Amino acid sequence: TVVSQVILKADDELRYPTTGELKNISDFLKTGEQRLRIVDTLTENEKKIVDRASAQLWKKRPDFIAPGGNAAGQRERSLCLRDYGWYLRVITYGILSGDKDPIESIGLIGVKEMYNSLGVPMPGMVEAIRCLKEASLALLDDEDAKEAAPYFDFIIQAMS
Amino acid sequence: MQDAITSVINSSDVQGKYLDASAIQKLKAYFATGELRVRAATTISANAANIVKEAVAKSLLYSDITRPGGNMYTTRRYAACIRDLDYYLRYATYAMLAGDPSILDERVLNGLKETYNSLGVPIGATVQAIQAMKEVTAGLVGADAGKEMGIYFDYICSGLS
Amino acid sequence: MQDAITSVINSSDVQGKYLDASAIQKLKAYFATGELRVRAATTISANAANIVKEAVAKSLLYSDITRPGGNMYTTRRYAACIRDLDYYLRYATYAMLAGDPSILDERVLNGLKETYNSLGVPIGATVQAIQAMKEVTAGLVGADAGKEMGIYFDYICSGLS
Amino acid sequence: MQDAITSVINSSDVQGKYLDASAIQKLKAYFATGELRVRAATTISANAANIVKEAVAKSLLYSDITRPGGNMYTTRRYAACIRDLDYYLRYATYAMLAGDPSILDERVLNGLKETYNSLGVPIGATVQAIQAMKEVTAGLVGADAGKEMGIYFDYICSGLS
Amino acid sequence: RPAPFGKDTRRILIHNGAGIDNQLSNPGARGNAPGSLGPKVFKLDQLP
Amino acid sequence: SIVTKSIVNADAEARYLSPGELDRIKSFVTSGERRVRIAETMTGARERIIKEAGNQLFQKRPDVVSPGGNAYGEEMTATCLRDLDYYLRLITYGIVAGDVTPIEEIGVVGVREMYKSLGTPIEAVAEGVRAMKSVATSLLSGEDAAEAGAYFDYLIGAMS
Amino acid sequence: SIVTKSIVNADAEARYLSPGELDRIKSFVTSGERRVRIAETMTGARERIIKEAGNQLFQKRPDVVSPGGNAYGEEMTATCLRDLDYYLRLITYGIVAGDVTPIEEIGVVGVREMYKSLGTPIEAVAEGVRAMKSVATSLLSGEDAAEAGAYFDYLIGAMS
Amino acid sequence: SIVTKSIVNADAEARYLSPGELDRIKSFVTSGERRVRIAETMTGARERIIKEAGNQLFQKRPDVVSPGGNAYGEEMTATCLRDLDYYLRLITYGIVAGDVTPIEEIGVVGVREMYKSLGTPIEAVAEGVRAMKSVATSLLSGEDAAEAGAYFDYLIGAMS
Amino acid sequence: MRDAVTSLIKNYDITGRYLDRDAIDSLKSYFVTGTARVQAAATITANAAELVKQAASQLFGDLPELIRPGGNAYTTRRYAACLRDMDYYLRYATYALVAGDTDVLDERVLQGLRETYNSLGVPIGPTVVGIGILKDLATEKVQAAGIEVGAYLEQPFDHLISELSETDV
Amino acid sequence: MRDAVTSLIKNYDITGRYLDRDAIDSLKSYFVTGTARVQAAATITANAAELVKQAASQLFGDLPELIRPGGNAYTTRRYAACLRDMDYYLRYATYALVAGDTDVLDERVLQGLRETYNSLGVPIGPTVVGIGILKDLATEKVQAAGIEVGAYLEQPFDHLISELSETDV
Amino acid sequence: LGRPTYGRQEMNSYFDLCSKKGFYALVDAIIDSVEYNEAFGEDTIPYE
Ligand SMILES: *[C@@H](C)[C@H]1/C(=C/c2[nH]c(/C=C3N=C(/C=C4\NC(=O)C(CC)=C4C)C(C)=C\3CCC(=O)O)c(CCC(=O)O)c2C)NC(=O)[C@@H]1C
Ligand SMILES: *[C@H](C)[C@H]1/C(=C/c2[nH]c(/C=C3N=C(/C=C4\NC(=O)C(CC)=C4C)C(C)=C\3CCC(=O)O)c(CCC(=O)O)c2C)NC(=O)[C@@H]1C
Ligand SMILES: *[C@H](C)[C@H]1/C(=C/c2[nH]c(/C=C3N=C(/C=C4\NC(=O)C(CC)=C4C)C(C)=C\3CCC(=O)O)c(CCC(=O)O)c2C)NC(=O)[C@@H]1C
Ligand SMILES: *[C@H](C)[C@H]1/C(=C/c2[nH]c(/C=C3N=C(/C=C4\NC(=O)C(CC)=C4C)C(C)=C\3CCC(=O)O)c(CCC(=O)O)c2C)NC(=O)[C@@H]1C
Ligand SMILES: *[C@H](C)[C@H]1/C(=C/c2[nH]c(/C=C3N=C(/C=C4\NC(=O)C(CC)=C4C)C(C)=C\3CCC(=O)O)c(CCC(=O)O)c2C)NC(=O)[C@@H]1C
Numbered sequence A: 001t002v003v004s005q006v007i008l009k010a011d012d013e014l015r016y017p018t019t020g021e022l023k024n025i026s027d028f029l030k031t032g033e034q035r036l037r038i039v040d041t042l043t044e045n046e047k048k049i050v051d052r053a054s055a056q057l058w059k060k061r062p063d064f065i066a067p068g069g070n071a072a073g074q075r076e077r078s079l080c081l082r083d084y085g086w087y088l089r090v091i092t093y094g095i096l097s098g099d100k101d102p103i104e105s106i107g108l109i110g111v112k113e114m115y116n117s118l119g120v121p122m123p124g125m126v127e128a129i130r131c132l133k134e135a136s137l138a139l140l141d142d143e144d145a146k147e148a149a150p151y152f153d154f155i156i157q158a159m160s
Numbered sequence B, C, D: 001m002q003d004a005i006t007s008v009i010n011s012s013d014v015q016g017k018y019l020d021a022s023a024i025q026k027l028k029a030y031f032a033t034g035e036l037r038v039r040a041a042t043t044i045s046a047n048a049a050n051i052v053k054e055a056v057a058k059s060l061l062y063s064d065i066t067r068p069g070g071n072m073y074t075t076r077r078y079a080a081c082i083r084d085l086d087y088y089l090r091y092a093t094y095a096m097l098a099g100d101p102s103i104l105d106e107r108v109l110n111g112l113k114e115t116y117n118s119l120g121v122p123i124g125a126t127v128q129a130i131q132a133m134k135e136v137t138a139g140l141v142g143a144d145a146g147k148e149m150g151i152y153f154d155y156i157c158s159g160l161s
Numbered sequence E: 001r002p003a004p005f006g007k008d009t010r011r012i013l014i015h016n017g018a019g020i021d022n023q024l025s026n027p028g029a030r031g032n033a034p035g036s037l038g039p040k041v042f043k044l045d046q047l048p
Numbered sequence F, G, H: 001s002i003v004t005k006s007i008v009n010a011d012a013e014a015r016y017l018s019p020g021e022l023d024r025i026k027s028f029v030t031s032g033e034r035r036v037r038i039a040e041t042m043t044g045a046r047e048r049i050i051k052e053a054g055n056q057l058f059q060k061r062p063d064v065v066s067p068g069g070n071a072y073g074e075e076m077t078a079t080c081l082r083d084l085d086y087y088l089r090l091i092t093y094g095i096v097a098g099d100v101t102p103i104e105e106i107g108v109v110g111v112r113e114m115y116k117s118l119g120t121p122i123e124a125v126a127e128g129v130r131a132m133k134s135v136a137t138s139l140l141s142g143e144d145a146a147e148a149g150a151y152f153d154y155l156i157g158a159m160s
Numbered sequence I, J: 001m002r003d004a005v006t007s008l009i010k011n012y013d014i015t016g017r018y019l020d021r022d023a024i025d026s027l028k029s030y031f032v033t034g035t036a037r038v039q040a041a042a043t044i045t046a047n048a049a050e051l052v053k054q055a056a057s058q059l060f061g062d063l064p065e066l067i068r069p070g071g072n073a074y075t076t077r078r079y080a081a082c083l084r085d086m087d088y089y090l091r092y093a094t095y096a097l098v099a100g101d102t103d104v105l106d107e108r109v110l111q112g113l114r115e116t117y118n119s120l121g122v123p124i125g126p127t128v129v130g131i132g133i134l135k136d137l138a139t140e141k142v143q144a145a146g147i148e149v150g151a152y153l154e155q156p157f158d159h160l161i162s163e164l165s166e167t168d169v
Numbered sequence K: 001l002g003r004p005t006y007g008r009q010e011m012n013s014y015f016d017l018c019s020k021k022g023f024y025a026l027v028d029a030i031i032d033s034v035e036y037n038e039a040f041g042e043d044t045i046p047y048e
């Protein structure tokens, strides 16, 4: 959130937070009930999303389900369906916090090489989040589609 | 560093579930008190050389401690003592801005209890100076936000004693 | 000539005190009934003339008070009694929106009482008419507002008698 | 007195028709500028006495008018002048929120061509005090409203001459 | 000479007396005596 | 309207507009889109409103259409059907202006003396205003029937 | 308050409370929690306001404490600061009541003839209440210091 | 500004512009028309603020004006109004920028070494800018005086 | 008579000042619309003799009290006089459209018009409807010619409505 | 680093003046484009990791004289270093697009860049073509995103061209 | 009342009152107004 950007920004310069960020703190804290229109409409519509994007991935790139792929067995596909709603959980942490600080330190720092420790390649899993964005933004209303769209958009850049 | 926003992120993430109703009742309480805490953090920083002055001029000057013999006789002890009381007030306002005392657990109460007995610093006098600094601060910001520092001023005094 | 806000000011201006929490409790009981009083004002706006008619058709106009021999018989005495039963209501909802009978103390009760002892207007018919106006007000605005409407009518019954 | 809301109503009523789409479109042009007018009123009424003080020192003080012989000599004729400039400021801000100078045709500019002649007030100094008042209230309210404030000052300024 | 006057208009009048003591500025000052500038106000005190 | 009613109240006290009065204009100007949307439902469906409330008045008071009445016959009823066009035009002028003075100067002041000279019963045409309140609330929303219906309850007490 | 101001102005015309001004009673009486919360900050910090504006007043005017003036020793300076506490009570009474009218009934309308009779200088009291504004608005938030600053501005206009 | 401070923080982590600072900046730039009509009124009344806070300072601190103080004499007390002319001029740069990096780089970072080298008391300026705040909050409306008054309150914390 | 330029002259002449920054930007606001003013004034006079004929037949088909023997448009002595007295409202609306403000309308047509029609028995009522049928229309031939339309091209027409018709509210 | 606001501060600070009418209208000209600045900066970072990949494959398909063993983009030691050294030009173009002027580009990326590339043998030539391919391939995703485009968002880029490349004429 | 009439709505309220009630309530309605009683009092001769 915005508040841990400011305290960790004012500790090493040894100074109180000035008005340039205290106006920036108070502007985030009046937008909670605007952001809470987005966070529950992702929440109870989770299972509608989680396989509408999962069918969207394999109709676009079927090699993770192809024999010799990654989720060719059911114990991998049960893992990979779980990771969508894990990514839908941490994205909704970011829309609540309004920043990057939960979405950094849970599911984004170091994923570029620790999928490579597993079998799953990187840029197909970039396609999994990009189809998950349009599976969620079609469910979202349009005037608040543009607010939650950069939070999905950061995961595309940081993973690829 | 754990904000009260990020504290209920982490307590929801250790269960791996989404935000429930009782978690959101911590956020919507915290989103309600946003403008109150920002008004307090301005007027402390405009008075942070006077809150640190009227705390020590009330409780510690002309005492045993400013007199020759104990712990604030020389000027370098006085400069070190006003360095602490400035730093307690500067670290109390972050917990007022966060709404969580995890700043005080991480950045203040780590080595401080061990290094005061190791230096011969009277804990019983510096638990009183922060206690004297509370009702200066509760008068300087207004008693609605004066009941907000009292959690985080005495979180130091709960840890340092 | 003053409302419930400045009543608990003037109740607390004397003996020098400030607004204590019992006095704030009296203010909070007026503020939560702010929704009930103003829609009770607009309910009797549209039916101000019919409520004078339906009061006197229930009680007054078939008796010997309106017969010759009585005192509501001629039209110049009919026009004043139908002016009074209008203006008893027209100051009642002024006192209902204010929140005390202090309006009724200063512009109903100090002059209307000893006038009727010197005019020969009968006064037991008035309280018999203001009770007939009391039940038909609660039958028009609803019983949620009538139980606090009738105390202002019963202030007129207490002072006229 | 014609509000800019009521001027569209008085236009649309005398034709007999209801509210057209074009007549609704004029009110939305007023309502989009409604924030800019109500900002300008509250930033004046806090310091309406200060604008009067800053306008007499710009154009009227240390002149022939405030000297003996002039018309702002002998403080009967000076306290009347300072409230006179208070009148134009108070009636410009009513004409601001009305969005229509119809107040100034009714309550301001009736006698002021003849009452200043019939009191010996020089119009050539109060028409410059108005323009000096516009040049300080454009700096006090802002560059955007001060053009639109300056419409209703120059309606008074052309009405005096 | 007619003139089309409005629905509500205020004729501007001059206070016969003190200049600031017009009632349009201060309505709480109209009960005052006008003093030496205005005319003589009479009142009844002594009844025989 | 709202401001020119509050200007002429602020002129008799000889004072600028209070900050307790200026936020009334500030709230009314920002809530200007909603009250216009109330007004188009009055104008766009007014042939339903007069014809239903005209039927409701002649059932609540059948003495008007009787012989020896004011609105008797085809012609004389047609202006009583047209007088309710006039009062409904003042309500839809009133909710746009937000106040009572566009209604008060046009239809409220002389109305005790007007219908006195024309021979109609004044409260009977005032009863049809009360029936016109009931139909105009039936085509209206939850909050909008309470706000726009308050001027309807002005007008029944205006004539009575 | 605004209730009695909308009753006295409704009684001189003898009208039944036109629904333009009943919307004022809708937003006065429901919004009393905002206004009484300003009064808790003044009453809760009563002992700080008077003492911090006491010595600030005596710095501006050292004639008053010094012998020759009107407050010598502890005894007259105690009632000097009690006299400010009569006004801090009165500003608290004006904040709850919406407008200025419970102050002229208590503390305005004889204060020039009073203080001339007691021998105290009238404008030195006006420096005291001006010093009380300089501490109270620092304690208060900015959107509420316009409201409390109006009643503090009146009292300087009352004594001077 | 805030836009420099959002870039410079995002440049240090070497990522792109976050969805956090995309919305701090967008909320700044849609408040950009509001802050300039705050900052114009300071510059539109700069001769009144300097004259009133100059009147407000010297009665609070008469050791300065009295001989042997620093601003003594008609050339020296003209410089102390010029010494406050700069700090009012700097605050209008901070209101426009939305932060205090115009205040910091120009009027903060070497103040106590300079004013010790000039002979003036440092805390006497901190009363004067605080007295300059008390006439600036009487200019603006209430919701803007909390914004522009915070930039005054930053400058007090740099002095003392 | 009195242009928007010359109204800004004696808005500045009587206070004795030069042309400042506000004078140089309000006058440029008039000149950027001057191409749209003149080309709208051409197409208003494209069929201006037809434009009064389409309006009054749309008037008298809307208010048929003014044809049947009632208020004065009864004979062709009245009706052809009505079309002429309509045509002044179209012709003077062309002038103030070009002139910027309405001060040409203020002292050529509006002064005495409440007193001329009262002396004849001509109603002021449907005259407001007669300008109300033109100001909305006039906009049709500006729209069908391709010129934008809105701020002005009504600036003149409802100044013939809000100042001619008597104030009710 | 140095915003268009803060560049106008020390355009006015060094002469010791307040904010006049020219300051109040040039700064409003920045703020009316600020909605168009930020939403263009979102969609530039929509596929910014893809946008360098589409540009450099369109670069090296256009100038093979940088794939075959010649100038230094030969191995993946060079090529993945080339995609990173391309990606700084995209990332710093986002900052100055939001910041208004190019002073963020002036003292973060441009200073020393003639002297870093000469010390390595990296040519300055196709780097200008690499920003010139990013010149129009940034405008495509602003155009397909519905943002208007114009000098803003097509300027940061040629300030990386007209000041990095050496002057010929 | 010692002043001229104030405008039009202040005079239209008097013209209908002598149209219905007569002259005897016109001279009443001037006297029991607030502007007579609170600006002159109940024991003063009126003055202009
Ligand atoms: C039926 C309602 C009762 C009744 C009434 C009746 N009233 C009068 C005369 C007067 N009543 C008043 C009333 C008021 N004066 C006030 O100031 C207030 C407070 C608002 C009130 C309610 C006044 C002034 C009069 C005198 C009127 C006058 O012009 O003289 C009469 C007397 C009429 C007469 O002359 O005989 C009567 C009979 N009559 C009943 O039967 C009921 C008891
Ligand atoms: C003050 C009224 C009391 C007091 C203070 C005092 N402290 C020291 C020495 C130190 N104080 C600290 C403090 C902190 N370290 C932290 O990380 C934090 C959280 C921000 C704090 C508050 C440390 C590390 C030291 C030792 C190192 C140093 O050089 O200061 C002294 C000096 C002791 C000496 O003998 O010189 C004093 C005087 N002591 C009292 O007497 C008061 C009760
Ligand atoms: C057509 C075969 C028949 C016809 C039709 C007609 N006339 C009009 C319009 C008007 N007619 C008049 C008539 C007269 N004016 C006079 O002064 C006299 C002498 C006393 C007469 C008979 C007038 C003034 C008009 C114009 C006003 C109006 O609309 O009535 C119309 C309407 C035209 C239109 O739609 O604009 C029609 C269809 N006239 C004839 O002569 C034939 C009998
Ligand atoms: C017709 C649509 C409307 C109507 C018109 C009508 N007008 C008249 C007579 C006159 N109209 C004028 C008006 C002007 N003269 C001017 O110089 C100007 C400014 C340029 C105006 C607006 C005048 C002076 C007259 C008198 C005759 C004359 O022109 O000298 C009549 C004739 C009345 C009669 O019956 O003789 C008519 C019918 N009347 C309507 O009903 C329509 C609303
Ligand atoms: C596909 C079956 C065959 C193939 C095709 C291919 N490669 C490229 C692009 C590149 N290839 C290289 C190759 C190397 N880099 C090294 O460091 C080494 C070890 C010495 C090798 C072999 C590089 C750097 C590129 C990128 C630059 C370039 O465009 O050449 C393409 C073009 C891809 C595009 O269009 O963007 C194609 C079609 N590569 C194979 O391995 C298969 C033999």
Ligand SMILES: *[C@H](C)[C@H]1/C(=C/c2[nH]c(/C=C3N=C(/C=C4\NC(=O)C(CC)=C4C)C(C)=C\3CCC(=O)O)c(CCC(=O)O)c2C)NC(=O)[C@@H]1C
Pocket: J056, J066, J071, J072, J073, J077, J078, J079, J081, J082, J083, J085, J086, J088, J108, J109, J110, J113, J116, J120, J122, J123, J126, J127, J130
């Ligand atoms: C690729 C499309 C082009 C190209 C790139 C290339 N660059 C390098 C090496 C470096 N580039 C930089 C540049 C910057 N560093 C900065 O901090 C900034 C400002 C943010 C810039 C612009 C630097 C410092 C290097 C040196 C390595 C390092 O980053 O530490 C290489 C490597 C050279 C080699 O062969 O080893 C390459 C290939 N070269 C081209 O041909 C294309 C035009």
Ligand SMILES: CCC1=C(C)/C(=C/C2=NC(=C\c3[nH]c(/C=C4\NC(=O)[C@H](C)[C@H]4CC)c(C)c3CCC(=O)O)/C(CCC(=O)O)=C2C)NC1=O
Pocket: A063, A064, A065, A070, A071, A076, A077, A079, A080, A081, A083, A084, A086, A087, A106, A107, A118, A119, A120, A124, A125, A126, A128
């Ligand atoms: C909290 C942040 C976080 C997440 C979400 C996470 C997920 C995660 N995904 C895994 C595997 C996997 N992930 C995938 C995913 C895919 N293959 C494809 O073709 C698709 C593009 C993509 C489909 C969604 C598959 C198939 C496996 C199983 C591979 C294996 O374990 O053998 C594994 C290892 C085994 C397991 O637990 O299932 C972890 C720990 N780890 C983390 O630290």
Ligand SMILES: CCC1=C(C)/C(=C/C2=NC(=C\c3[nH]c(/C=C4\NC(=O)[C@H](C)[C@H]4CC)c(C)c3CCC(=O)O)/C(CCC(=O)O)=C2C)NC1=O
Pocket: B060, B061, B062, B063, B065, B066, B067, B068, B072, B073, B074, B075, B078
């Ligand atoms: C051995 C080294 C040593 C030093 C340096 C020292 C300074 C010292 N000076 C003090 C007070 C003081 N010191 C002064 C002195 C001065 N102010 C003036 O205006 C005079 C010109 C000036 C004299 C140089 C004053 C007035 C106080 C009291 C301040 C107050 O109570 O607010 C106090 C606080 C009271 C106490 O606890 O003692 C300390 C610690 N004490 C020490 O033990």
Ligand SMILES: CCC1=C(C)/C(=C/C2=NC(=C\c3[nH]c(/C=C4\NC(=O)[C@H](C)[C@H]4CC)c(C)c3CCC(=O)O)/C(CCC(=O)O)=C2C)NC1=O
Pocket: D061, D062, D066, D067, D072, D073, D074, D075, D078
């Ligand atoms: C014959 C009746 C009469 C009086 C009294 C009068 C006073 C009067 N005093 C003025 C100014 C002034 N008067 C003073 C006088 C004083 N300031 C102080 O601080 C002291 C308390 C005080 C006297 C000891 C000052 C300083 C000014 C100019 C205001 C300024 O410089 O800002 C002005 C404005 C400029 C001028 O014309 O001089 C008038 C009109 N005019 C009159 O017609």
Ligand SMILES: CCC1=C(C)/C(=C/C2=NC(=C\c3[nH]c(/C=C4\NC(=O)[C@H](C)[C@H]4CC)c(C)c3CCC(=O)O)/C(CCC(=O)O)=C2C)NC1=O
Pocket: D065, D071, D072, D076, D077, D078, D080, D081, D082, D084, D085, D087, D088, D091, D107, D108, D112, D115, D119, D121, D122, D125, D126, D129, E012, E013, E014, E015, E018, E019, E020, E021, E022, E024
């Ligand atoms: C907006 C509506 C309005 C106007 C126009 C107005 C004018 C006005 N000016 C008056 C007096 C005055 N007005 C002035 C004002 C001036 N003479 C000067 O030299 C200066 C140029 C100028 C003001 C700075 C003076 C000097 C008098 C006193 C004349 C006298 O009392 O004989 C009076 C008579 C006393 C009174 O009743 O207040 C009126 C009515 N009052 C109003 O309510």
Ligand SMILES: CCC1=C(C)/C(=C/C2=NC(=C\c3[nH]c(/C=C4\NC(=O)[C@H](C)[C@H]4CC)c(C)c3CCC(=O)O)/C(CCC(=O)O)=C2C)NC1=O
Pocket: F057, F064, F070, F071, F072, F076, F077, F079, F080, F081, F083, F084, F086, F087, F106, F107, F111, F114, F118, F119, F120, F121, F124, F125, F128
């Ligand atoms: C906008 C302000 C306005 C009002 C108030 C108004 C009233 C009005 N009502 C009229 C007639 C009438 N109005 C009625 C109406 C009614 N009679 C009944 O019996 C019903 C109970 C009641 C209505 C439901 C009748 C019967 C007449 C004809 C009276 C007659 O011609 O003798 C007339 C005369 C003919 C006309 O021009 O319509 C006027 C002027 N006109 C206005 O312009």
